[PDB]
């Protein structure tokens, strides 16, 4: 069947805002995974998982009769899709059990890994998510082979359809770089937001850059793809050496033997794939990467044997049975155990990407420190493992169960405890009134509250107003946040805070993070009153103020908005049409198209635009909450033409007189161009729509103010 | 950005079951369109509409200073997408304003039509759907120009994203037949369920079959396409002559002057398209179809000029200014007014398809009767116009407003009015008790009430259990419905109904239509109890029994399920894979992926399979409401392979022993193969999920029993 996407390939795709509907979710609408998981017998699951580790199934026999390695690869892949650029991928959604991830090349035979876990999933049911299970299984594999994990958090709720993610433009799996959809430019610049070197790879090519077996080169890819997945040099080394401490690769024969990935397989494959015609096609004849490396002498036990082999040998270029570039210790004793035949033994082996830890100068200082001190190694790897598998879970208030590390880590963008009485309705009222009495404008209040709350992304549940980090580096010096304006607003708000807090009894006081949002709420009430409408904007206190010290300034950089359709803001020129970038920002803010539309409309007329630009400000009554944006946008009496100066700026002229009425961007005009968006603009541009616009707007305003409030 | 479709195009698409969610809908989830339209001043709109008829706009000047003709083609096009095969398309959903219909070649310049209607839409807001306005405007165009309409029902609710319709496989707009994706094979067989002869056309080519101007061949395509949109010869001729009594075609210059269809237009065109570079682009210079025909001396007035001109001249093949095949009267005077210059008249002209009404033997006779008896012409066209525009609104209880025809039309599959008191709860109990005492099996009861209820489709809101049409021709003789068993079940139910009704006073009685559904419920209560669950199934009485005479046998034949995955029924071998046909039927039944999963699960184990086939009956306790289907399907203990005899039947063998456990169809297994459906299967095959599965299935059962119950 021919689709709108066939006919009109370049059109906005809005479907991405409308995933995770009550329709696709088989759980009741009242279902709460947190409440389900906090009555789970976590101990009882881990015992089942421990037993599993050494209970081989003939359809996928365990290497060394212990699955631990397989399950560490599986949990590491589940978490290793994650890009800091957008916070998309990661373990958090369990998105490995769905297309495309479930059928990537790098995720080959993890289908068997998950299939092994069905009977434990089946047993415990809704009380443990697949998403929690995939991580917990990795943690139990490590514990079962004598490694102390740093902790575990439940509360990764299952999703029920594929995340809509940009994995790349490439139309061939594992396509080498230089192609018609090359993700590499310049001096090997990997394109944002991508954090892999090839379509269907987790991070880098184990044979080396585009198969070139040079461990210096490879280290460039490893540093890059890992920095892009939140991991520094030390964390990278800990994670690679720590993992490649366990199990083995599988390359027993040619790759040509392997059949269709799960999404392509027969119906009768019941969701498995890479069915192999090579001998038994499993256990000792298993093909997965096509490489045949077994790293340590105790593949099913925590050791420091990896770095021992690594440093204690010289290494020779060789080819797996599948024809794949790997390395073998030159003139070594057959010390490494076979996985299935106790009589055979193999020389030590390495990937190009393992030698990277040795031959990259900066990795080598870290690798040698860990070699000499396997207790430093074991602590790094544990911390790195925790971070890896919890990077995308959001604030510590989400973390469920009895194994949550009590140590607060910098990467968790931590929020101080609240020790004191919160402000009540009467207080909120008093403070809103004080904000307005100050002389702060609707536009200053609404712009500040927006800049603060709009850093949130449900992708990795980072950002949001909580913690007042807009007052700190680097949020407070972001172009989009109008630094000098922000400075005055905040300096004014902090006087109101100091006064209010100074007058209080019973140790009651208000965070600056509460007041920035209260102020932005005062501004929306004033704006409604400006349009002759008395509304109360909802407000939930209990935010706290993170310090500059509680804030990693490097980790904060990916949360900088460089496109904000809601502030008619572009920082530079992009391949991507601004309107596509708008749908992106809206996805991250968790907004439906109806919510995106009502929100952008109100903001334009509230003066939320960056630099008080007139683009999209389709009102004569600015700082009044009205549906002017839509009425004016959809007015056939106006005619719209691209400017001579700027093709992405438009003049709206009276169709009769040729009088200039309005200017606007693609972000503004798309609401009267896009079939489905115009349809929505129409509802809010209709005569009967003043009440519904104001009501919907306060709603999606409150939703964005509360995006990062998991403490409720 | 490569997607899951790009990688795996043949993979089932569940998104079609998860459209029309509360997420994409901008109206609150309490919003009732019926109650907004019941408060609407219908008169005030029709008044505003009448004014519009002759309020020309610079940007699309009205032909003859009256838009009536343009608005009648806009109405007819909204309704003209309808196929009887699946009831999809039609005017019921205002789908013309969305891709792809909004950008079809045959809807060229109708963007302008809809645009003209904005200010009225804007005025009356939510109280009139776009869907109701497009048809109402068509009606007021006819009333304006002196044609009395049979009437008008409102209550077509606006949709908010594209319906997911198969319009064909061609990847070139208007592609002629015999292409790599031809919708025609053999002796010009149009592939079901398509009702147009080329991609982006309503019914036929106006130049004639694949641009060949033979009005005798053209006649065949018209008879076919209109047949396929619910219209016999009499209604067809009434409708073509009815329409082409008004307005003109637009072919002022060559089609190459016409630019991007709306969906492809730049953002500045604000949702309009086909911008022409010929002269002024509009009015006298209008290109739409590239044909230049005016049929009547009075294009803005109801006449009997059409048949007059048709029969009154011999016709001469010529070419529009665009190079298109049309016809011009031989040696006729210029009696036809120009639309813009009083100083010009033109000879009478016709389309190849207009001449079809004359040169087709069967059409000629109805054309002659209409010529001779213009009172019959008028009445036929009035009825065929009401049918065209109300075909897909479903049962008469859905019809809102003061202008609803009192006259009950065979094509509306009418339901008699309930005169008498309904069975109460006490009565239902006593009836379910007698059903179960009869010795009707669970399988018999669930099969029958499924057979009845599941004929329903929300596409065109036809079918369902109301009317007990399962007891009539042709439903009672359908293969899917197991004629002989059905005979015996109904026979027994009627004895019970006859006894119950015979006992009663105050003139209370139960329809057979009610009792069939009640017994299905009794069946489902018995199956719960067989599984040791105490369940009551909800049951709403009020169904009535249609007579044979109230049931068009021919029109009922498009509701015959040649595929029902819910009964593992396929009538023969289809190019389309059965699992697609299952999804197809789920959409038609208004079912979510979860609801389809739950329902098929229960039905399998309840004995609802055609011919008592084992295919997918994964349980040892048949006729007991359990999640056996899911637990057994997802049992990794079982290996599945296609049979030698049938690639479409599968064997479930113990992975250890080789002993056959099960057989399944593609429909059974797809739940173990599709990654999103398997996700769903897993929830219901879990060990905590036996109660949830029963409740979820009683819910979707009672939904399907109530699908056609707009009388509530
Ligand atoms: C540059 C980074 C990395 C590369 C190129 C890499 C590459 C590979 C390759 C090619 C395999 C063979 C898969 C097979 O054939 O079945 C493998 C296996 C494995 N990797 Fe990685 N890996 C990397 C990082 C990591 C990390 C961070 C972890 C864990 C924290 C990890 C844990 C494992 C484990 C446990 C296996 C063995 C699975 C089994 O027992 O069957 N790797 N790796
Ligand atoms: C075989 C069936 C039909 C064919 C091939 C056909 C073809 C055409 C064509 C080519 C146009 C010119 C479009 C343009 O250039 O603007 C047109 C106009 C029109 N048709 Fe049809 N038509 C058919 C049936 C009908 C029916 C059933 C109706 C109404 C019930 C209808 C009502 C009209 C009207 C009102 C216009 C005039 C639009 C205007 O004045 O701007 N047609 N038709
Ligand atoms: Cl539930
Ligand atoms: Na994420
Ligand atoms: Na329909």
PDB file of C-alpha atoms in Angstrom, chain A residues 310-497:
ATOM      1  CA  UNK A 310      46.607  -7.467  27.619  1.00  0.00           C
ATOM      2  CA  UNK A 311      49.984  -6.252  29.061  1.00  0.00           C
ATOM      3  CA  UNK A 312      51.679  -9.676  29.614  1.00  0.00           C
ATOM      4  CA  UNK A 313      51.795 -10.633  25.863  1.00  0.00           C
ATOM      5  CA  UNK A 314      52.663  -9.217  22.445  1.00  0.00           C
ATOM      6  CA  UNK A 315      49.841  -9.590  19.860  1.00  0.00           C
ATOM      7  CA  UNK A 316      49.582 -10.720  16.161  1.00  0.00           C
ATOM      8  CA  UNK A 317      46.888  -9.913  13.509  1.00  0.00           C
ATOM      9  CA  UNK A 318      44.808 -13.081  12.718  1.00  0.00           C
ATOM     10  CA  UNK A 319      41.349 -13.967  11.218  1.00  0.00           C
ATOM     11  CA  UNK A 320      38.383 -15.693  12.998  1.00  0.00           C
ATOM     12  CA  UNK A 321      36.886 -18.767  11.253  1.00  0.00           C
ATOM     13  CA  UNK A 322      34.351 -16.167   9.871  1.00  0.00           C
ATOM     14  CA  UNK A 323      37.260 -14.163   8.278  1.00  0.00           C
ATOM     15  CA  UNK A 324      37.181 -11.371  10.940  1.00  0.00           C
ATOM     16  CA  UNK A 325      40.290  -9.344  12.082  1.00  0.00           C
ATOM     17  CA  UNK A 326      41.279 -10.282  15.706  1.00  0.00           C
ATOM     18  CA  UNK A 327      44.533 -10.631  17.737  1.00  0.00           C
ATOM     19  CA  UNK A 328      46.208 -13.641  19.487  1.00  0.00           C
ATOM     20  CA  UNK A 329      49.105 -13.717  22.041  1.00  0.00           C
ATOM     21  CA  UNK A 330      52.294 -14.493  19.988  1.00  0.00           C
ATOM     22  CA  UNK A 331      53.788 -17.854  21.171  1.00  0.00           C
ATOM     23  CA  UNK A 332      51.474 -18.231  24.219  1.00  0.00           C
ATOM     24  CA  UNK A 333      50.563 -21.471  26.110  1.00  0.00           C
ATOM     25  CA  UNK A 334      47.019 -22.777  25.320  1.00  0.00           C
ATOM     26  CA  UNK A 335      45.821 -21.458  28.787  1.00  0.00           C
ATOM     27  CA  UNK A 336      42.263 -20.296  27.796  1.00  0.00           C
ATOM     28  CA  UNK A 337      39.484 -22.885  28.335  1.00  0.00           C
ATOM     29  CA  UNK A 338      37.181 -24.083  25.514  1.00  0.00           C
ATOM     30  CA  UNK A 339      33.475 -23.254  26.186  1.00  0.00           C
ATOM     31  CA  UNK A 340      32.128 -26.826  25.592  1.00  0.00           C
ATOM     32  CA  UNK A 341      35.053 -29.386  25.287  1.00  0.00           C
ATOM     33  CA  UNK A 342      37.081 -29.653  28.554  1.00  0.00           C
ATOM     34  CA  UNK A 343      40.013 -31.378  26.692  1.00  0.00           C
ATOM     35  CA  UNK A 344      40.786 -28.411  24.339  1.00  0.00           C
ATOM     36  CA  UNK A 345      42.511 -25.107  25.327  1.00  0.00           C
ATOM     37  CA  UNK A 346      43.171 -21.927  23.240  1.00  0.00           C
ATOM     38  CA  UNK A 347      45.841 -19.125  23.289  1.00  0.00           C
ATOM     39  CA  UNK A 348      44.801 -15.712  24.742  1.00  0.00           C
ATOM     40  CA  UNK A 349      43.002 -13.472  22.149  1.00  0.00           C
ATOM     41  CA  UNK A 350      41.952  -9.758  21.881  1.00  0.00           C
ATOM     42  CA  UNK A 351      39.857  -7.421  19.639  1.00  0.00           C
ATOM     43  CA  UNK A 352      41.573  -4.371  18.015  1.00  0.00           C
ATOM     44  CA  UNK A 353      39.250  -2.434  20.420  1.00  0.00           C
ATOM     45  CA  UNK A 354      40.771  -4.278  23.462  1.00  0.00           C
ATOM     46  CA  UNK A 355      44.367  -3.423  22.328  1.00  0.00           C
ATOM     47  CA  UNK A 356      43.037   0.177  22.216  1.00  0.00           C
ATOM     48  CA  UNK A 357      43.131   0.169  26.070  1.00  0.00           C
ATOM     49  CA  UNK A 358      46.915  -0.560  25.681  1.00  0.00           C
ATOM     50  CA  UNK A 359      48.197   1.403  22.603  1.00  0.00           C
ATOM     51  CA  UNK A 360      46.164   4.629  23.014  1.00  0.00           C
ATOM     52  CA  UNK A 361      48.572   6.607  25.292  1.00  0.00           C
ATOM     53  CA  UNK A 362      45.834   8.031  27.614  1.00  0.00           C
ATOM     54  CA  UNK A 363      43.875   4.699  27.904  1.00  0.00           C
ATOM     55  CA  UNK A 364      47.239   2.984  28.686  1.00  0.00           C
ATOM     56  CA  UNK A 365      47.913   5.106  31.860  1.00  0.00           C
ATOM     57  CA  UNK A 366      44.384   4.160  33.108  1.00  0.00           C
ATOM     58  CA  UNK A 367      44.744   0.468  31.949  1.00  0.00           C
ATOM     59  CA  UNK A 368      48.162   0.227  33.762  1.00  0.00           C
ATOM     60  CA  UNK A 369      46.780   1.866  36.986  1.00  0.00           C
ATOM     61  CA  UNK A 370      43.944  -0.787  36.947  1.00  0.00           C
ATOM     62  CA  UNK A 371      46.337  -3.680  36.065  1.00  0.00           C
ATOM     63  CA  UNK A 372      48.510  -2.694  39.120  1.00  0.00           C
ATOM     64  CA  UNK A 373      45.419  -2.061  41.355  1.00  0.00           C
ATOM     65  CA  UNK A 374      42.481  -4.356  40.370  1.00  0.00           C
ATOM     66  CA  UNK A 375      40.583  -2.843  43.406  1.00  0.00           C
ATOM     67  CA  UNK A 376      40.607   0.631  41.660  1.00  0.00           C
ATOM     68  CA  UNK A 377      39.506  -1.197  38.434  1.00  0.00           C
ATOM     69  CA  UNK A 378      36.736  -3.144  40.271  1.00  0.00           C
ATOM     70  CA  UNK A 379      35.363   0.134  41.854  1.00  0.00           C
ATOM     71  CA  UNK A 380      35.475   2.202  38.578  1.00  0.00           C
ATOM     72  CA  UNK A 381      33.791  -0.654  36.611  1.00  0.00           C
ATOM     73  CA  UNK A 382      31.052  -0.956  39.338  1.00  0.00           C
ATOM     74  CA  UNK A 383      30.390   2.830  39.372  1.00  0.00           C
ATOM     75  CA  UNK A 384      30.636   2.899  35.510  1.00  0.00           C
ATOM     76  CA  UNK A 385      28.221  -0.131  35.323  1.00  0.00           C
ATOM     77  CA  UNK A 386      25.680   1.623  37.688  1.00  0.00           C
ATOM     78  CA  UNK A 387      25.888   4.909  35.660  1.00  0.00           C
ATOM     79  CA  UNK A 388      25.682   3.089  32.226  1.00  0.00           C
ATOM     80  CA  UNK A 389      22.515   1.132  33.296  1.00  0.00           C
ATOM     81  CA  UNK A 390      20.930   4.127  35.239  1.00  0.00           C
ATOM     82  CA  UNK A 391      21.970   7.163  33.051  1.00  0.00           C
ATOM     83  CA  UNK A 392      18.458   7.483  31.524  1.00  0.00           C
ATOM     84  CA  UNK A 393      16.313   6.826  34.672  1.00  0.00           C
ATOM     85  CA  UNK A 394      16.145  10.524  35.712  1.00  0.00           C
ATOM     86  CA  UNK A 395      16.060  11.983  39.261  1.00  0.00           C
ATOM     87  CA  UNK A 396      16.987   9.763  42.278  1.00  0.00           C
ATOM     88  CA  UNK A 397      13.299  10.096  43.359  1.00  0.00           C
ATOM     89  CA  UNK A 398      12.435   7.561  40.541  1.00  0.00           C
ATOM     90  CA  UNK A 399      14.849   4.860  41.977  1.00  0.00           C
ATOM     91  CA  UNK A 400      12.847   1.920  43.489  1.00  0.00           C
ATOM     92  CA  UNK A 401      13.700  -1.067  45.717  1.00  0.00           C
ATOM     93  CA  UNK A 402      16.144  -2.007  48.514  1.00  0.00           C
ATOM     94  CA  UNK A 403      19.508  -1.847  46.534  1.00  0.00           C
ATOM     95  CA  UNK A 404      19.549   1.897  45.609  1.00  0.00           C
ATOM     96  CA  UNK A 405      23.100   3.200  46.230  1.00  0.00           C
ATOM     97  CA  UNK A 406      22.782   5.781  49.101  1.00  0.00           C
ATOM     98  CA  UNK A 407      25.782   7.627  47.500  1.00  0.00           C
ATOM     99  CA  UNK A 408      24.604  10.698  45.496  1.00  0.00           C
ATOM    100  CA  UNK A 409      26.677  10.953  42.249  1.00  0.00           C
ATOM    101  CA  UNK A 410      27.354  14.194  40.292  1.00  0.00           C
ATOM    102  CA  UNK A 411      25.977  12.732  36.967  1.00  0.00           C
ATOM    103  CA  UNK A 412      22.530  12.327  38.650  1.00  0.00           C
ATOM    104  CA  UNK A 413      22.190  16.201  38.666  1.00  0.00           C
ATOM    105  CA  UNK A 414      21.236  15.829  42.339  1.00  0.00           C
ATOM    106  CA  UNK A 415      18.486  17.799  44.167  1.00  0.00           C
ATOM    107  CA  UNK A 416      19.058  18.538  47.878  1.00  0.00           C
ATOM    108  CA  UNK A 417      16.591  17.023  50.411  1.00  0.00           C
ATOM    109  CA  UNK A 418      13.768  19.366  51.591  1.00  0.00           C
ATOM    110  CA  UNK A 419      14.074  19.636  55.426  1.00  0.00           C
ATOM    111  CA  UNK A 420      11.509  22.467  56.031  1.00  0.00           C
ATOM    112  CA  UNK A 421       7.755  23.245  55.775  1.00  0.00           C
ATOM    113  CA  UNK A 422       6.621  24.051  52.167  1.00  0.00           C
ATOM    114  CA  UNK A 423       4.538  27.202  51.304  1.00  0.00           C
ATOM    115  CA  UNK A 424       0.697  26.732  51.241  1.00  0.00           C
ATOM    116  CA  UNK A 425      -2.007  28.189  48.890  1.00  0.00           C
ATOM    117  CA  UNK A 426      -2.165  31.473  50.978  1.00  0.00           C
ATOM    118  CA  UNK A 427       1.679  31.751  50.700  1.00  0.00           C
ATOM    119  CA  UNK A 428       1.680  31.078  46.884  1.00  0.00           C
ATOM    120  CA  UNK A 429      -1.018  33.801  46.476  1.00  0.00           C
ATOM    121  CA  UNK A 430       0.993  36.264  48.642  1.00  0.00           C
ATOM    122  CA  UNK A 431       4.227  35.537  46.672  1.00  0.00           C
ATOM    123  CA  UNK A 432       2.570  35.763  43.163  1.00  0.00           C
ATOM    124  CA  UNK A 433       1.161  39.213  44.210  1.00  0.00           C
ATOM    125  CA  UNK A 434       4.678  40.262  45.443  1.00  0.00           C
ATOM    126  CA  UNK A 435       6.188  39.111  42.045  1.00  0.00           C
ATOM    127  CA  UNK A 436       3.641  41.298  40.163  1.00  0.00           C
ATOM    128  CA  UNK A 437       4.003  44.286  42.610  1.00  0.00           C
ATOM    129  CA  UNK A 438       7.795  44.084  41.875  1.00  0.00           C
ATOM    130  CA  UNK A 439       7.240  45.365  38.300  1.00  0.00           C
ATOM    131  CA  UNK A 440       8.377  42.161  36.526  1.00  0.00           C
ATOM    132  CA  UNK A 441       6.443  41.977  33.206  1.00  0.00           C
ATOM    133  CA  UNK A 442       4.281  38.979  32.099  1.00  0.00           C
ATOM    134  CA  UNK A 443       6.987  38.530  29.364  1.00  0.00           C
ATOM    135  CA  UNK A 444       9.892  38.422  31.891  1.00  0.00           C
ATOM    136  CA  UNK A 445       8.016  36.054  34.302  1.00  0.00           C
ATOM    137  CA  UNK A 446       6.801  33.673  31.514  1.00  0.00           C
ATOM    138  CA  UNK A 447      10.189  33.738  29.630  1.00  0.00           C
ATOM    139  CA  UNK A 448      12.196  32.905  32.845  1.00  0.00           C
ATOM    140  CA  UNK A 449       9.834  30.090  34.088  1.00  0.00           C
ATOM    141  CA  UNK A 450       9.949  28.684  30.472  1.00  0.00           C
ATOM    142  CA  UNK A 451      13.816  28.844  30.154  1.00  0.00           C
ATOM    143  CA  UNK A 452      14.043  27.063  33.599  1.00  0.00           C
ATOM    144  CA  UNK A 453      11.381  24.265  33.095  1.00  0.00           C
ATOM    145  CA  UNK A 454      11.981  23.604  29.340  1.00  0.00           C
ATOM    146  CA  UNK A 455      15.454  21.946  29.735  1.00  0.00           C
ATOM    147  CA  UNK A 456      13.528  18.718  30.664  1.00  0.00           C
ATOM    148  CA  UNK A 457      13.480  15.728  28.240  1.00  0.00           C
ATOM    149  CA  UNK A 458      11.485  12.514  29.012  1.00  0.00           C
ATOM    150  CA  UNK A 459      14.154  10.808  26.795  1.00  0.00           C
ATOM    151  CA  UNK A 460      16.563  10.510  29.792  1.00  0.00           C
ATOM    152  CA  UNK A 461      14.405  12.456  32.349  1.00  0.00           C
ATOM    153  CA  UNK A 462      17.228  15.044  32.716  1.00  0.00           C
ATOM    154  CA  UNK A 463      16.520  18.817  33.076  1.00  0.00           C
ATOM    155  CA  UNK A 464      13.521  20.781  34.470  1.00  0.00           C
ATOM    156  CA  UNK A 465      12.962  23.729  36.881  1.00  0.00           C
ATOM    157  CA  UNK A 466      13.739  21.625  40.009  1.00  0.00           C
ATOM    158  CA  UNK A 467      17.116  22.683  41.499  1.00  0.00           C
ATOM    159  CA  UNK A 468      17.188  26.278  40.083  1.00  0.00           C
ATOM    160  CA  UNK A 469      20.206  25.404  37.840  1.00  0.00           C
ATOM    161  CA  UNK A 470      19.200  28.284  35.468  1.00  0.00           C
ATOM    162  CA  UNK A 471      20.828  30.586  38.123  1.00  0.00           C
ATOM    163  CA  UNK A 472      24.050  28.475  37.831  1.00  0.00           C
ATOM    164  CA  UNK A 473      26.625  27.969  35.038  1.00  0.00           C
ATOM    165  CA  UNK A 474      26.096  27.056  32.325  1.00  0.00           C
ATOM    166  CA  UNK A 475      22.250  27.469  32.009  1.00  0.00           C
ATOM    167  CA  UNK A 476      22.595  31.134  33.217  1.00  0.00           C
ATOM    168  CA  UNK A 477      24.886  32.051  30.227  1.00  0.00           C
ATOM    169  CA  UNK A 478      22.943  30.200  27.436  1.00  0.00           C
ATOM    170  CA  UNK A 479      22.018  32.544  24.469  1.00  0.00           C
ATOM    171  CA  UNK A 480      18.411  31.131  24.510  1.00  0.00           C
ATOM    172  CA  UNK A 481      18.067  32.203  28.215  1.00  0.00           C
ATOM    173  CA  UNK A 482      18.742  35.924  27.438  1.00  0.00           C
ATOM    174  CA  UNK A 483      21.505  36.120  30.059  1.00  0.00           C
ATOM    175  CA  UNK A 484      21.367  39.865  31.054  1.00  0.00           C
ATOM    176  CA  UNK A 485      17.487  39.831  31.269  1.00  0.00           C
ATOM    177  CA  UNK A 486      17.677  36.537  33.285  1.00  0.00           C
ATOM    178  CA  UNK A 487      20.212  38.253  35.647  1.00  0.00           C
ATOM    179  CA  UNK A 488      17.733  41.089  36.489  1.00  0.00           C
ATOM    180  CA  UNK A 489      14.646  38.797  36.828  1.00  0.00           C
ATOM    181  CA  UNK A 490      16.583  36.422  39.160  1.00  0.00           C
ATOM    182  CA  UNK A 491      18.181  39.318  41.163  1.00  0.00           C
ATOM    183  CA  UNK A 492      14.598  40.678  41.672  1.00  0.00           C
ATOM    184  CA  UNK A 493      13.005  37.236  42.474  1.00  0.00           C
ATOM    185  CA  UNK A 494      15.811  36.545  45.077  1.00  0.00           C
ATOM    186  CA  UNK A 495      14.928  39.802  46.954  1.00  0.00           C
ATOM    187  CA  UNK A 496      11.275  38.551  47.117  1.00  0.00           C
ATOM    188  CA  UNK A 497      12.589  35.156  48.357  1.00  0.00           C
TER     189      UNK A 497
END
